[model samples]
Target chain A: NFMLNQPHSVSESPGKTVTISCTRSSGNIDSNYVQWYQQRPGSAPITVIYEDNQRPSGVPDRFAGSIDRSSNSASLTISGLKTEDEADYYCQSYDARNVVFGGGTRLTVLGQPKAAPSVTLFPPSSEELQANKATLVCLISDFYPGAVTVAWKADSSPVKAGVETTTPSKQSNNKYAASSYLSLTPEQWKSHKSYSCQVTHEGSTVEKTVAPTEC
Target chain B: NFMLNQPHSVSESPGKTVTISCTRSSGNIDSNYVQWYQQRPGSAPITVIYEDNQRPSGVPDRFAGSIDRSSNSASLTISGLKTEDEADYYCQSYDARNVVFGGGTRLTVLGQPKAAPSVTLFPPSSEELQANKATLVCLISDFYPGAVTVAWKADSSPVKAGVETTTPSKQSNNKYAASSYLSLTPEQWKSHKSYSCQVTHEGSTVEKTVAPTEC
Candidate 1:
């Protein structure tokens, strides 16, 4: 079965409207019923729209669901959004007896005071340094609104390979944290004197560096 | 330190209004900020009312929160209810540095087609009988709306002592299940030739029996 694709993220100001789209990789979107679920941080998801466009009891009418045949996609449109409406939304449908969900979309309600994350770069363990392999970790924490971008650089040059980053996860205090990893062979690690992690939240960026010599 | 007392359960027809009350013991209800949470079957609880009476965004206006100093109580009222409103409601407040929660109240919406559970009563293990103690288990499954009353009976008479029952839990297929336990001494077990578990769902009762002779 093909997958349902969704935007990685979307953001809008409060009192405005935002629509998250879930496009089917193959087959018509109308062949099956599409449901939309809203998941807030630290809570289980709840169905906001079921049977394509029907709102469950106690859900406000401002949240609507629709499908477009031309795009082979379904969309969840939220109107008059508020700060509390910020959450992750997922679209799901069934193929025969198997259920499939789109990659969730993070909805950010802008205009709230933004808090930039504190970034920390951890050098490789000493044991790994002797094994001709290395791995570096970058921890990002204490951010608000739960949206951030991370990039890795080595000696002031972009490093795109062997890099992986996680989506922001909300902490108990409502702040967010994320992590990024970089892997390298000893030859690559020794070639660079320093590696850095840059984190961007809202409009500002913070960077932390770690040097191979420190290990 | 005091407790918040709530009703065991409440039920009403759809389109009607229902209010669940939480009474504070040994303290003024208004002394601390109260919050209300709604927990659907198999889902994490969500805050319905925070800061005493504020509704989170996306929650409908039909759900309201109030407090009464005259009775030292707080209330969560849901108006124009629907079947999907059926769930458990809990009230919570802080005491000094500790947090306290009321025994949750179950809200059942009536008039929907109710399904009675299939009850299976298991006799005590032979090993337990040899030890002069016995514990019987009653499993109830495949019911709708997740509300049921379980009672134990011995030889056609009510057996109130040493009986424990759990609230219904939702199953993956949207049906519900629950369990009950009956503990007894060997002497008491011998005194009653047969014990039965009666499960009442909606308005109908289904019973399953286990007998010492069966073992």
Candidate 2:
């Protein structure tokens, strides 16, 4: 079996060099391939390296990787760091039975602070919910990096189940946006006083609330 | 986050029935739907249940599932067990942030006693693997339930990497066979005193060592 380890977080200025390691445990580092993935805040993990030391297609040249058999480790180096590159990086390896992801490295590229993302709460249409299915969507947009978080509340009580969410995705202009939908039935919808969608990012949290009448 | 637990192993006779529960820890079983999958030996995990109570298109009626909110558990019952039904079953769910799969249940649907598989060690061909690669293949055939393990050795130490193995795959006559490939460079294969192929199963373990003349 193999495991990957990395620093919990790192900070650097844009255009500076940042080096991180994906040290492994109890295995041959050279022969067993170790892969790297870049996980932007809410996006799914993307494959960066496979078959040991080659960059996966579509990955830019700013990232580089190597395997050190002597130390039983692998590394990724990024130079001229871009603001968009300030998300988490994960090391991936295959065990004989399954694939695993290591504890990620959260890279923080320090510079001008980011603005709070705009959040909007949209309740299901009155006519659409007449038959009993109820849904509410929380839209989060204009976030600097894809690493944003979304949560839901019903009358200020955190909503846990019957909710579907999307990973933060890139918009046409290259910023990020995401949405979370809370689902309920007709009886629950009529009695609930308020529904709120909360969005959290770099330095601020925004919540959009709407009552039944307001919706 | 929620977690799942099941008995490590379950045993039953071919004509009888068995029911196993995928119990949860610290979460409501009904609020968050539980999913189920079956991992037969040598094959990828296949979905048996999705969206709580709904079965996927091809699952048989013999497999039934239900969730109990009071106990925070989901149960799967298999009736009229076939030899093929003896496989590892898993239940899956999601914690707000991640997808979780239960520790699987190893089902042993007992019938007649099984015989040890016949194993043959095939060395690399002279016309092939001379330039770039050298290899050995361990053919394990005529097994039941596919509960088989394969291993390799060179000069009596265990071999780990550059090995590709299989779960028991079905033959036209309905028995199972598995294989393990040991890869080495031509120089290492040529100078080695002996190479071995070992197979282990329920009641027996077999090892065969091949010397230079045998090759």
> Number of the top candidate by TM-score?
1
Clash pairs (backbone) in predicted model 1:
none
Off by over 4 Å in 2: A1-215, B95-100, B112-126, B129-138, B144-215
Q: Tell me the tens digit of each residue's lDDT in model 2 across A180-213.
A: 5566786777788977878766535778776765
lDDT of 1 by residue, A15-107 (tens): 999999999998889999888878665443566887789876668999999999999999999999988888878887877745577867878
Q: What's the count of clashing pairs in each model shown? A: 0, 1
Cα-based lDDT for every prediction: 0.75, 0.68
The numbered model that scores best in lDDT is 1
C-alpha lDDT (0 to 100) for residue B190 of candidate 2:
78
Candidate 1 runs further than 4 Å off: A114-128, A131-133, A139-144, A148-177, A183-215, B1-215
